[PDB]
Structure prediction request, 55 residues.
Amino acid sequence: MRVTMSLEALTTEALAAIAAAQDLVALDQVRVQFTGKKSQLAEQSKALGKMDPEE
Prediction:
């Protein structure tokens, strides 16, 4: 998934994907598509630092 337009809904989806990962290799798979590797946190961090002096 990727289309979750809510920060709180992103966390509970991330925490549920972490608790479901039953392998160490699958744990990095949860982390890759949820952190910096063009995930939803990376796109939100790039948009928040594009046109937001006070925002």
